[PDB]
Amino acid sequence: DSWRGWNIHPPSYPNGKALESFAKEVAEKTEGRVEPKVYHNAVLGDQPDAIEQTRSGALDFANFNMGPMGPIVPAANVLSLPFIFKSPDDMYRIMDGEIGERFADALAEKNLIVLSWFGSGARSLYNTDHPVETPDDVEGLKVRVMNNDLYVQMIDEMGGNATPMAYGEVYQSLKTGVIDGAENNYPSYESSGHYEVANYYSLTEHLILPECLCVAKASWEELSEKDRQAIREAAEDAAKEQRALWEEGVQASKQKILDAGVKINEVDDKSAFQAKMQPIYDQFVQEHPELESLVTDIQDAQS
Ligand SMILES: O=C(O)[C@H]1O[C@@H](O)[C@H](O)[C@@H](O)[C@@H]1O
Numbered sequence: 001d002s003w004r005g006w007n008i009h010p011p012s013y014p015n016g017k018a019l020e021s022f023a024k025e026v027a028e029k030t031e032g033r034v035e036p037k038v039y040h041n042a043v044l045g046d047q048p049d050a051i052e053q054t055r056s057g058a059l060d061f062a063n064f065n066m067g068p069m070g071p072i073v074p075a076a077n078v079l080s081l082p083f084i085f086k087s088p089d090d091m092y093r094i095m096d097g098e099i100g101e102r103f104a105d106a107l108a109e110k111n112l113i114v115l116s117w118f119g120s121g122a123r124s125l126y127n128t129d130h131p132v133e134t135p136d137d138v139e140g141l142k143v144r145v146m147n148n149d150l151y152v153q154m155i156d157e158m159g160g161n162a163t164p165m166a167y168g169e170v171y172q173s174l175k176t177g178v179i180d181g182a183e184n185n186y187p188s189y190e191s192s193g194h195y196e197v198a199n200y201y202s203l204t205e206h207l208i209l210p211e212c213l214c215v216a217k218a219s220w221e222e223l224s225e226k227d228r229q230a231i232r233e234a235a236e237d238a239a240k241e242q243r244a245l246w247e248e249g250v251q252a253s254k255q256k257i258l259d260a261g262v263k264i265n266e267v268d269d270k271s272a273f274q275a276k277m278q279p280i281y282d283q284f285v286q287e288h289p290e291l292e293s294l295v296t297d298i299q300d301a302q303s
């Protein structure tokens with residue numbers, strides 16, 4: 001069983017190393033019956049297209065951010081509500097409990113089998129013009145977002161205007177002035193080179209998104225129980241590794257961007273940004289009353 005897998009990041013990124021460890025452990029633990037290979041840098045497609053190829057069984061496994069999953073799996077959109085998690089540690093705690101299984105079940109209905117959860121820190125605004133200290137500083141900024149309408153609503157409510165765009169296109173768009181900014185965690189802001197062209201990083205920390213390590217349902221269904229169990233074990237090992245590497249990477253990436261002269265600032269009052277997101281939550285629970293208890297259960301877990 002040859003398996004092809006997808007990663008958007010470079011091979012040396014925390015997620016990349018963890019997926020290479022996964023591939024190696026799978027081959028060993030299945031005695032060569034399943035032999036995964038990871039293709040990095042999104043060479044097999046942009047994230048929405050890779051999601052579709054994995055759902056249809058054309059790709060066997062992947063590491064997907066739950067952000068672009070929202071338009072495909074309704075429950076996953078809960079994770080894209082701005083500020084729904086107070087910190088990465090709260091996200092890990094919640095996703096590692098019974099609530100995380102609700103999201104795995106929802107993905108399975110759309111042909112994706114979640115084996116473990118990777119972290120992706122906290123996404124913050126960066127731009128080419130000035131520090132963002134209050135929401136009014138976002139006025140006039142054209143900010144790239146991922147492919148989920150909630151992010152357009154998010155930027156618009158903060159005061160700016162948004163444009164959905166593939167991750168691979170962002171560097172050149174910033175360089176040429178087509179966009180003024182984008183938003184991401186420390187390791188992506190650094191790895192991608194965006195920090196070289198957008199020198200202001202303002203810690204809005206507005207999205208804390210899980211990422212899955214998942215397998216195509218069609219590929220999963222070809223396996224014996226023994227090999228399913230082996231691959232589960234390999235994925236749990238890979239997630240523990242990824243999370244440890246992740247924190248080391250946040251530290252290393254911050255040092256690199258500081259050394260390069262990036263201007264990092266805290267926002268005056270994060271609660272001022274959070275208050276402006278209220279209409280997004282209102283509209284969401286009105287549209288999706290069947291998801292309301294998922295939203296309130298996550299909120300209640302962080303009182
Ligand atoms: O902004 C993006 O598109 C990227 O953001 C990173 O944080 C996620 O790890 C990666 O999956 C996304 O493709």
Ligand SMILES: [Cl-]
Nearest residue numbers: 121122185186
């Ligand atoms: Cl981060």
Ligand SMILES: [Cl-]
Nearest residue numbers: 046047166167
């Ligand atoms: Cl993409």
